[PDB]
């Protein structure tokens, strides 16, 4: 993996590391999962950590996180996080994100919305003015 790739995964790791101490605990994993609408049990959190806890000290450090992330990338069907994310938004895969597609992602992620907010979000990202957000515009905005 390149240094830029390592940096991206550091960003991801930091979205979980609540205390910023360099490790992801079962409790931290659970907080993120709870925020996403999931309520895993303690043993469940323990197995998720265990499967990736290479040295077995009970928490996940960045090297272990990287091994996991690297394993995912080093696979034919795995794309870059940014591209994978764009595809979550662009469900019909035509390369453009519609208002309906944006409302769907926001709803799925528990983000409240109004039509005006959605229209301004698109407008702000819509550089070529075609009424939708293409990949290039998606990258620029994100």
């Amino acid at each position: 993996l390149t240094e830029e790739q390592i940096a991206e995964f550091k960003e991801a790791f930091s979205l979980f590391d609540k205390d910023g101490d360099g490790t992801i605990t079962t409790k931290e994993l659970g907080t993120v999962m709870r925020s996403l609408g999931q309520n895993p049990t303690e043993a469940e959190l323990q197995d998720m950590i265990n499967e990736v806890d290479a040295d077995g000290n009970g928490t996940i450090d960045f090297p272990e996180f990287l091994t996991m992330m690297a394993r995912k990338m080093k696979d034919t069907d795995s794309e870059e996080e940014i591209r994978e994310a764009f595809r979550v938004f662009d469900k019909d895969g035509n390369g453009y994100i519609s208002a309906a597609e944006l409302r769907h992602v926001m709803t799925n992620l528990g983000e409240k919305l109004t039509d005006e907010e959605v229209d301004e979000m698109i407008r702000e990202a819509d550089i070529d003015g075609d009424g939708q957000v293409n990949y290039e515009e998606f990258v620029q905005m994100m």
């Binding site: 960003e11 991801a12 979205l15 979980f16 994993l29 993120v32 999962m33 925020s35 996403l36 999931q38 998720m48 950590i49 499967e51 990736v52 996991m68 992330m69 394993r71 995912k72 996080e81 994978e84 994310a85 979550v88 992602v105 926001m106 992620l109 528990g110 983000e111 907010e117 301004e120 979000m121 702000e124 990202a125 905005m141 994100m142």
Partner: peptide
């Protein structure tokens, strides 16, 4: 009053969702 913050929050929430799935897909 820019909308960039909402866009950025969605990306971050999705990135977290994908990492959780990765903890599950691992094998």
């Amino acid at each position: 009053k820019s909308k960039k913050a909402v866009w950025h929050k969605l990306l971050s929430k999705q990135r977290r969702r994908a990492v959780v799935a990765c903890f599950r897909m691992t094998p």
